[PDB]
Coordinates of C-alpha atoms (C1' of nucleotides) and ligand atoms in Angstrom, one line a residue:
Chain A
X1 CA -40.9 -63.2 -29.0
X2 CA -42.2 -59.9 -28.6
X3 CA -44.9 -60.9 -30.5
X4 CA -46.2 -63.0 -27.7
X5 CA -45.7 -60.0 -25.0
X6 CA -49.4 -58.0 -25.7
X7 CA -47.2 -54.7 -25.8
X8 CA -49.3 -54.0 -29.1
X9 CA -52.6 -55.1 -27.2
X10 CA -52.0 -52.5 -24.5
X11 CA -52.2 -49.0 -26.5
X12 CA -54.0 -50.1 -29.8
X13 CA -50.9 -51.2 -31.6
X14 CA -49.2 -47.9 -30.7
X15 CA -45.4 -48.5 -29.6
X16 CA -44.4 -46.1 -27.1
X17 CA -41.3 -44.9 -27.6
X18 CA -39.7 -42.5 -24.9
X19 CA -37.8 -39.5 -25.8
X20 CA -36.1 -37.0 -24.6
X21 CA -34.0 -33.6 -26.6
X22 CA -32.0 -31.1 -25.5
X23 CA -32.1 -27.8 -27.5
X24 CA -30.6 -24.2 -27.7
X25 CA -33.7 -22.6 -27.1
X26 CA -37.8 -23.1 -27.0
X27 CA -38.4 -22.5 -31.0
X28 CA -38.2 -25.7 -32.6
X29 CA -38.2 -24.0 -36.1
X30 CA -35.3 -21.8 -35.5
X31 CA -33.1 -23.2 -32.8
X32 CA -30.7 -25.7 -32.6
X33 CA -31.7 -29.6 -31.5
X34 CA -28.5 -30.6 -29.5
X35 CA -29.1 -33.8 -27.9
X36 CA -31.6 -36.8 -28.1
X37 CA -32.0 -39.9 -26.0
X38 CA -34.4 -42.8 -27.2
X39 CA -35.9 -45.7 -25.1
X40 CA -37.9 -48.3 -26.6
X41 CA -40.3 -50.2 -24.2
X42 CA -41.2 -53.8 -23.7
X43 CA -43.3 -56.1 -21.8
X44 CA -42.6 -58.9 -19.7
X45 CA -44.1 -62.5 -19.0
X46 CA -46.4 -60.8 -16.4
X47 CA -47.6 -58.1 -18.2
X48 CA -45.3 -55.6 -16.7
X49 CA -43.9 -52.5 -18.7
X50 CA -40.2 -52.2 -18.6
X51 CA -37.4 -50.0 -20.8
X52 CA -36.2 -52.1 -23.4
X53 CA -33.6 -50.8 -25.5
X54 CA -31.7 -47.1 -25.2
X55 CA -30.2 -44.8 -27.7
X56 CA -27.9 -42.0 -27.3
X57 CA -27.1 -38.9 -29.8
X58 CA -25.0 -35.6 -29.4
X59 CA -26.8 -33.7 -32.7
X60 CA -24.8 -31.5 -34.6
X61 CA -26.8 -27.4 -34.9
X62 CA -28.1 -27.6 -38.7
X63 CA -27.3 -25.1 -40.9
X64 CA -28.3 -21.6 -39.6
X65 CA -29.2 -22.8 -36.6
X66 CA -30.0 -20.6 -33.8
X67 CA -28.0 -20.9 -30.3
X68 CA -29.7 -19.1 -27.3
X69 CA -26.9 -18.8 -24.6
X70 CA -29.1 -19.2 -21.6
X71 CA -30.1 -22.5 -23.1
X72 CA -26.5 -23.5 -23.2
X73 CA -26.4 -22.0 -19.7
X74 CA -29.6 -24.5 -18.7
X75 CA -28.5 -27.3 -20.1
X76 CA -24.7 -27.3 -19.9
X77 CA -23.7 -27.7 -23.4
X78 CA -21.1 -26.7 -25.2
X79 CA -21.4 -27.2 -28.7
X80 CA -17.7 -26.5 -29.9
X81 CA -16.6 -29.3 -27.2
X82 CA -14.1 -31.6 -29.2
X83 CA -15.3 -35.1 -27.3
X84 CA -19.0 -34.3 -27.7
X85 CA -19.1 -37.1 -30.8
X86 CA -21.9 -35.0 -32.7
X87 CA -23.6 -36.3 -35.6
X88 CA -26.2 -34.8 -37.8
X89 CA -29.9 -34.5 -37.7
X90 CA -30.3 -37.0 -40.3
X91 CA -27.5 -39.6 -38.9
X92 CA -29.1 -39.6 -35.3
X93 CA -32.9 -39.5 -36.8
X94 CA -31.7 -42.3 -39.3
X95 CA -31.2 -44.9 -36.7
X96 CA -33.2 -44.0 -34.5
X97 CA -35.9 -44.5 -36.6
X98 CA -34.3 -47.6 -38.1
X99 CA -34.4 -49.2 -34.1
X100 CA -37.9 -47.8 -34.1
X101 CA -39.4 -49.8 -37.1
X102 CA -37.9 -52.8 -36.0
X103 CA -38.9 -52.4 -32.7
X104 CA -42.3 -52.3 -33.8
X105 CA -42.5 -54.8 -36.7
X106 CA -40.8 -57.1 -33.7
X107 CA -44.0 -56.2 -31.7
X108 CA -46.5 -56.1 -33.7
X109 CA -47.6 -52.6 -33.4
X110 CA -48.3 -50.6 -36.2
X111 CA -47.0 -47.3 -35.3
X112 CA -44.6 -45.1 -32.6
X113 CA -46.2 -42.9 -30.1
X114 CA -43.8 -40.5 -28.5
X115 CA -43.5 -41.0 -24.5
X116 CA -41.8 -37.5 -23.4
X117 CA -42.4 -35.1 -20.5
X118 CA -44.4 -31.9 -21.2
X119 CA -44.1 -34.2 -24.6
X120 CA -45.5 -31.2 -27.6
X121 CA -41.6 -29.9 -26.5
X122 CA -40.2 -33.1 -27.6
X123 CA -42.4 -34.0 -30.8
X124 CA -41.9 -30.4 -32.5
X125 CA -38.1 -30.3 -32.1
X126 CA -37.9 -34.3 -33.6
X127 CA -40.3 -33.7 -36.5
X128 CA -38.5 -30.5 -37.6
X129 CA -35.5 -31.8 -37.2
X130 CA -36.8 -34.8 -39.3
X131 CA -38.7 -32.9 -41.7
X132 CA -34.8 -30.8 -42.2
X133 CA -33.4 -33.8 -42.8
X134 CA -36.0 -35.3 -44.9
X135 CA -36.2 -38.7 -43.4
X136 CA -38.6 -41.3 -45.1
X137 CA -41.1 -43.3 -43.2
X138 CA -41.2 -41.6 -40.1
X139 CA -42.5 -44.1 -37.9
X140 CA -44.0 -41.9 -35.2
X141 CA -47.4 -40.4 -35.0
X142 CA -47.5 -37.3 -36.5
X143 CA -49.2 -35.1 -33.7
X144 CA -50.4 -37.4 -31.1
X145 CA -48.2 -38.4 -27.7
X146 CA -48.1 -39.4 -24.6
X147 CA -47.2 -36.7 -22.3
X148 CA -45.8 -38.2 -18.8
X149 CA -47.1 -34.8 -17.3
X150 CA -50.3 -34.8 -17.8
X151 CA -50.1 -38.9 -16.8
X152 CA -48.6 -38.0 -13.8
X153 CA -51.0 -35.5 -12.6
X154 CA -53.8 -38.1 -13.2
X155 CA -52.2 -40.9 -11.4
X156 CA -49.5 -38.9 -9.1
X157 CA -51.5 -35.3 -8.5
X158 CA -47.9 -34.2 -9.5
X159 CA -47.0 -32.5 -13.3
X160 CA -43.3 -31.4 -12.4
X161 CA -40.7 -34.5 -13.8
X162 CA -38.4 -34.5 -10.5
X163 CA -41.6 -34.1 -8.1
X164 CA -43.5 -36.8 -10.1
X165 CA -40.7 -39.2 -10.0
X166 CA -40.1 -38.7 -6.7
X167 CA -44.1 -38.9 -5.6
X168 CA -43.4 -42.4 -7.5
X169 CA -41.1 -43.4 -5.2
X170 CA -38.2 -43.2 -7.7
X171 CA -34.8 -41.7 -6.9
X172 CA -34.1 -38.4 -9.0
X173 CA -31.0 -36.9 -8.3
X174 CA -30.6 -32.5 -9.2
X175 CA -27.0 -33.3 -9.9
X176 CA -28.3 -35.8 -13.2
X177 CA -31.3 -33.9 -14.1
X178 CA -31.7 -31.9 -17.8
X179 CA -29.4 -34.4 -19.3
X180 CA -30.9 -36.0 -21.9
X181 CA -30.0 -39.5 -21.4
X182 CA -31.0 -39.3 -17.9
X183 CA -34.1 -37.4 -18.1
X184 CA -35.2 -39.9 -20.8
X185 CA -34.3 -42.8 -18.2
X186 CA -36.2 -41.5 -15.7
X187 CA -39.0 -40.7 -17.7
X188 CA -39.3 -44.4 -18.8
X189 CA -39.2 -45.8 -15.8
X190 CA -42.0 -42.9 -14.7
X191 CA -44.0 -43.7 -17.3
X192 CA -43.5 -47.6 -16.7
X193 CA -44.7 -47.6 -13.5
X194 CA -47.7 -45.4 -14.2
X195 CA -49.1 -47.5 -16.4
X196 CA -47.7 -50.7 -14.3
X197 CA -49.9 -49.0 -10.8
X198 CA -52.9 -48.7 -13.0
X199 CA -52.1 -52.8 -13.8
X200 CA -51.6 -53.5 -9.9
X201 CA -54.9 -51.3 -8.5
X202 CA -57.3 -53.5 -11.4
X203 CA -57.5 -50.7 -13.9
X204 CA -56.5 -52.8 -16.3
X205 CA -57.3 -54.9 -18.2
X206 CA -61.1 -54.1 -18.5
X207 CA -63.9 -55.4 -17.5
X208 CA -66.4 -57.5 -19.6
X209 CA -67.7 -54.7 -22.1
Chain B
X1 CA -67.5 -22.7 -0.8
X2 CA -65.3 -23.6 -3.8
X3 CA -62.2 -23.1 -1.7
X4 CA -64.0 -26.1 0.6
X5 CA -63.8 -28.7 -2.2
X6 CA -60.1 -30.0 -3.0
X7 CA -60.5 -29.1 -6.7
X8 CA -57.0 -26.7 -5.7
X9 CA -55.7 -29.7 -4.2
X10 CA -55.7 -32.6 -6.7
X11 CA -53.5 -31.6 -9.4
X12 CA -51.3 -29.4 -7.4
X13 CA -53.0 -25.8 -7.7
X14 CA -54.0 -26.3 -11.5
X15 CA -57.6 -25.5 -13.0
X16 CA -58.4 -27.5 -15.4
X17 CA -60.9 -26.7 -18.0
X18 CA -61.7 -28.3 -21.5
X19 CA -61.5 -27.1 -24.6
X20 CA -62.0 -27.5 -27.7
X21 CA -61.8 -25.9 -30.9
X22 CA -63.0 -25.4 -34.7
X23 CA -60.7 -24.2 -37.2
X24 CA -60.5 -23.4 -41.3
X25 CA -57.4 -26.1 -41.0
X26 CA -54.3 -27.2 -39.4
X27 CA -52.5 -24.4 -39.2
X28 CA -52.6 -22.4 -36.0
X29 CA -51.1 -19.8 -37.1
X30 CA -52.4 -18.8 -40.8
X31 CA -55.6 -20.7 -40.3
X32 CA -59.2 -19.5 -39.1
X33 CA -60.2 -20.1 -36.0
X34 CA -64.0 -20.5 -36.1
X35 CA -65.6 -21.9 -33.0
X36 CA -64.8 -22.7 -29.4
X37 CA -66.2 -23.8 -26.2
X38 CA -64.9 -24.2 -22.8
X39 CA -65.9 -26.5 -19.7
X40 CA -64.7 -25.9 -16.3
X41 CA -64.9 -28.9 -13.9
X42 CA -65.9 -28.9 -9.9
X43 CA -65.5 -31.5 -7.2
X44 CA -68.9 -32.9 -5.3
X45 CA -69.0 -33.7 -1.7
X46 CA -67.6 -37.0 -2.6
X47 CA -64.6 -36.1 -3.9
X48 CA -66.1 -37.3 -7.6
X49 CA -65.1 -34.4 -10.6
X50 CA -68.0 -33.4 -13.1
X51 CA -68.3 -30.4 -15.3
X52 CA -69.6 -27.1 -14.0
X53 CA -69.6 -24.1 -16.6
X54 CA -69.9 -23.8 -20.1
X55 CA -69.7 -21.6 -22.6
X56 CA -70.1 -21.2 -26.3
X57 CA -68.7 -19.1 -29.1
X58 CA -68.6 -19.1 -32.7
X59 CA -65.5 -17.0 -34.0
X60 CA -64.6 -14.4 -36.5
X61 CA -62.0 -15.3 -38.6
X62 CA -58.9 -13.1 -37.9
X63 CA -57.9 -10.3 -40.5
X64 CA -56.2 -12.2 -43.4
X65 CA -56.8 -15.5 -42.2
X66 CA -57.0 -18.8 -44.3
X67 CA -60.0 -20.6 -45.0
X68 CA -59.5 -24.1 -46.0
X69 CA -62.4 -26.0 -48.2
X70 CA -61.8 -29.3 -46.6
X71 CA -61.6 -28.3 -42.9
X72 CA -65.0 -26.0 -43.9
X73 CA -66.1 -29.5 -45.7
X74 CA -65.3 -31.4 -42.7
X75 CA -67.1 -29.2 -39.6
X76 CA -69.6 -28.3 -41.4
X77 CA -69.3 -24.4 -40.5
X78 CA -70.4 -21.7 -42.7
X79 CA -68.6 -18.9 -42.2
X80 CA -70.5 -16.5 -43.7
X81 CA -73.9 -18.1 -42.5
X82 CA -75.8 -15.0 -41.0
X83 CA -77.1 -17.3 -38.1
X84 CA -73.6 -18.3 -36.4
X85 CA -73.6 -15.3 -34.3
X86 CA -70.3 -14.2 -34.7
X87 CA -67.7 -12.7 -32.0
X88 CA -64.5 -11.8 -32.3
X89 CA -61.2 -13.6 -31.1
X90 CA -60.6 -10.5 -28.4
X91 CA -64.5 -11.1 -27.3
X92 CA -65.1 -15.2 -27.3
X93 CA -61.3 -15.2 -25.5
X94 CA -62.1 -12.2 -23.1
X95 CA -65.7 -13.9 -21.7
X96 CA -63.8 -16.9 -21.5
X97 CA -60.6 -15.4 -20.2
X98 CA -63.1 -13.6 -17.1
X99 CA -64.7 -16.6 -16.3
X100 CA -61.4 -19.0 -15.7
X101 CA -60.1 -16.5 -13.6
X102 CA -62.6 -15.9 -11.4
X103 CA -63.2 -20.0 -10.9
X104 CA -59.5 -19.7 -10.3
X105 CA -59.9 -17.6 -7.6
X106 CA -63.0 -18.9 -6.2
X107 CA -61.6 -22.5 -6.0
X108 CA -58.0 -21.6 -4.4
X109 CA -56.2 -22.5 -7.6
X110 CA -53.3 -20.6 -9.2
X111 CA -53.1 -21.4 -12.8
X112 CA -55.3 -22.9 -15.3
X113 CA -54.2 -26.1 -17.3
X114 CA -56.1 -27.2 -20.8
X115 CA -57.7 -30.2 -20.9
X116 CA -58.4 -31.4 -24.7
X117 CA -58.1 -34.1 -27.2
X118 CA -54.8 -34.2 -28.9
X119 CA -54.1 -31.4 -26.8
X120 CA -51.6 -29.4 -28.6
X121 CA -54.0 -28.7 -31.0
X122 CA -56.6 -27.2 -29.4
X123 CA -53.7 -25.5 -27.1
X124 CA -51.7 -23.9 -30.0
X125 CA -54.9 -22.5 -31.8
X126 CA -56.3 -20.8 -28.2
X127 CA -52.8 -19.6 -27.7
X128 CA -52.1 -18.0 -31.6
X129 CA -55.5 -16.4 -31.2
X130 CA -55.0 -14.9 -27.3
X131 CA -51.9 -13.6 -29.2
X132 CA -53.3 -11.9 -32.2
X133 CA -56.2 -10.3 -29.5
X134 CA -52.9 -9.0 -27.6
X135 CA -55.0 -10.6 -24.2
X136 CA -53.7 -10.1 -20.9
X137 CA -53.0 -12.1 -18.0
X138 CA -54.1 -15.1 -20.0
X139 CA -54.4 -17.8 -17.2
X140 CA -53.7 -21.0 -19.1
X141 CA -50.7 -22.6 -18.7
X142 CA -48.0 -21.7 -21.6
X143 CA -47.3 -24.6 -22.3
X144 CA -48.8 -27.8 -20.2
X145 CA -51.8 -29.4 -20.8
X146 CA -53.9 -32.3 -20.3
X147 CA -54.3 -34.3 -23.6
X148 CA -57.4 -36.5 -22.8
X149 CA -55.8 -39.2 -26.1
X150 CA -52.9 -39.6 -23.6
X151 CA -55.2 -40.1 -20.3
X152 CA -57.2 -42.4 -21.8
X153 CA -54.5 -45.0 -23.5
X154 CA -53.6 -45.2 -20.1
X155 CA -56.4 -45.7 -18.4
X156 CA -59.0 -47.0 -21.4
X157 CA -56.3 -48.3 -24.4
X158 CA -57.7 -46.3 -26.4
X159 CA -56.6 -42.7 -27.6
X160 CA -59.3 -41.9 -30.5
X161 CA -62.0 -39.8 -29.2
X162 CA -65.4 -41.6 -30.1
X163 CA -63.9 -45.1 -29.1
X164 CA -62.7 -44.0 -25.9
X165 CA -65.9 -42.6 -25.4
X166 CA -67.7 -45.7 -25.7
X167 CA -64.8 -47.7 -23.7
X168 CA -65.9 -45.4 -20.8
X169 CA -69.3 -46.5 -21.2
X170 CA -70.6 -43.0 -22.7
X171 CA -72.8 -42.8 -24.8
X172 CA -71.2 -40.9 -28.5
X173 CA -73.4 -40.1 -31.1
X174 CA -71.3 -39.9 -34.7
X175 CA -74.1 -37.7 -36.0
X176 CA -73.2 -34.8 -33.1
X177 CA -69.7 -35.3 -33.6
X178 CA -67.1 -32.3 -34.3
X179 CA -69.1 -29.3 -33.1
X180 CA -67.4 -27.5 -30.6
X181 CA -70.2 -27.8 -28.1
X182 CA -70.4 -31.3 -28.5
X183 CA -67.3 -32.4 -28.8
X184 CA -66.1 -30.4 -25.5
X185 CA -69.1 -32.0 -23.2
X186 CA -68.0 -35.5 -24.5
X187 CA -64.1 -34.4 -23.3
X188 CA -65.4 -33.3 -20.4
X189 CA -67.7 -35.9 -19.3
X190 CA -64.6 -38.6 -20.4
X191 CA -61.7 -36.6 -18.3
X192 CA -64.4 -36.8 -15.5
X193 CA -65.1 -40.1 -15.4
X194 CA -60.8 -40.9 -16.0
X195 CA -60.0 -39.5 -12.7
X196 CA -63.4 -40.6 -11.0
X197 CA -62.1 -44.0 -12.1
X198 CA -58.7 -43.5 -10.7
X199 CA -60.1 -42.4 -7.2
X200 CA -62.7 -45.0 -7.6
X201 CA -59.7 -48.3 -8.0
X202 CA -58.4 -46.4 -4.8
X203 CA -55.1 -44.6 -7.0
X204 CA -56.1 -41.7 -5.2
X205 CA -55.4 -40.4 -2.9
X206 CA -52.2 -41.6 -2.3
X207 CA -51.0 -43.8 0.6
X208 CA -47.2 -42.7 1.2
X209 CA -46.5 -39.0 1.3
Chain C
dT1 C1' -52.5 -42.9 -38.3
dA2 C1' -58.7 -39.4 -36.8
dG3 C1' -56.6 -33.2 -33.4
dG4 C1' -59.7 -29.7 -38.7
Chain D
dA1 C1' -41.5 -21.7 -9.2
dT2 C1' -45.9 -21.4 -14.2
dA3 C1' -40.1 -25.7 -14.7
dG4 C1' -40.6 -28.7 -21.6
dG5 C1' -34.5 -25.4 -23.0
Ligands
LIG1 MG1 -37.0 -32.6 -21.3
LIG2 MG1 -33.8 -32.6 -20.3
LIG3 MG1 -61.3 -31.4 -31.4
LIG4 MG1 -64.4 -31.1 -32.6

DNA sequence: TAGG
DNA sequence: ATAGG
């Protein structure tokens, strides 16, 4: 199983997990989380890194919530839409987390690290949302990521998502972008293939030492 | 002759300079922030990045700032030891405001970006205290940065600062640990040698544009 | 779990 | 675009 892959050998038992939200603003204290996408990562028989399993959540605003409207305008969403399917904070956290943990007890990994783009965004909008909700056993790290900007200007000279992705030879399509399961998807499959180039050009693994 | 390097050209217009910071805790925004230093970074002949200036400052707490007895327990700093030398956040941010911008200039850049460990961190505390010090034209990115813990699980596997250190062949020294000046040449010398790796496995520069 |  | 909403 998974336990035979060397995902846990790869980022000192760290299991990246990739994430992306979609909010009513840029204050993760005060404004509204609206939308989280989830994609667990695994690694195949040659080492490669790969997306392994994908969650989906339309979050409902918690209570008192602030809604910028330009956000709404951003990101399209309309929070009083009757087939958005929202669930709370603590629903969408819950299993979430719940995949998480087995994920990495599957892997043997220790802990979640957060794999998001411009990824201090991402980590204080989750955390608040899970501190509202007062989920147990949070299985991610509690302030360290790995941002897929700063990753990509190392490997790609590029920091933008759509610009990075598409120095990466990856498709990324305007139409798709800044929703959250897609901009998690690509950002997966970014971050895969960063770390998968530094595998192909010898970075990794090390030398003796 | 900075203009003549490529510095402007390999992270598409960005300066990056290190940073890091001591603090009275964890708290960026009702905790002291005691100590900074900053590292800018030039490009050789070669193509190979290496550090170019530094500077130094210990800080005066803000006005109605917290002290806590176990950050104070763990850097070691004094506060009120007559011999730190003291600036304020307006004068250690100013000096080190000037500076950026003129190696922005001088180099063909457009923007600084943050390099530091756990980036956030360091990012939130500069940020809180270039707000309290009502700074203008502060030349760091908002809100990107260049988390070195990130860089280096890619490209080392390791994301704690003293082993990635030694990973990377440095040489880090537990007993110079967590002062400011120390702990930013360390950051420095590490982001360095990340990208000088990079270009070195020939990930840089790219093949198809 | 290592940014003070 | 300084491009995480
Ligand atoms: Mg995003
Ligand atoms: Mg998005
Ligand atoms: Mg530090
Ligand atoms: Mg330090």
């Amino acid at each position: 199983n998974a336990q035979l892959t060397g995902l846990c050998d790869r980022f000192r038992g760290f299991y990246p997990v990739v994430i992306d939200v979609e909010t009513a603003g840029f204050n993760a204290k005060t404004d509204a989380l609206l939308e989280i996408a989830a994609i667990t990562l695994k690694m195949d028989e040659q080492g490669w890194l790969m997306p392994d399993t994908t969650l989906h959540f339309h979050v409902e605003p918690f209570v008192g919530a602030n809604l910028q409207p330009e956000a709404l305008a951003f990101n399209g969403i309309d929070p009083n839409d009757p087939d958005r399917g929202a669930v709370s904070e603590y629903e969408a956290l819950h299993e979430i987390f719940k995949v998480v943990r087995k994920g990495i007890k599957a892997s043997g990994c220790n802990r979640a690290i957060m794999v998001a783009h411009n990824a201090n965004f991402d980590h204080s909008f989750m955390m608040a949302a899970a501190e509202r909700a007062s989920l147990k056993r949070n299985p991610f790290h509690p302030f360290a990521t790995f941002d897929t900007a700063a990753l990509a200007g190392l490997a790609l000279g590029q920091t933008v998502l759509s610009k990075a992705c598409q120095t990466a030879g990856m498709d990324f399509d305007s139409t798709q972008a800044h929703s959250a399961l897609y901009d998690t998807e690509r950002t997966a499959v970014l971050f895969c293939e960063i770390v998968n180039r530094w595998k192909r050009l010898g970075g990794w693994p090390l030398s003796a030492a």
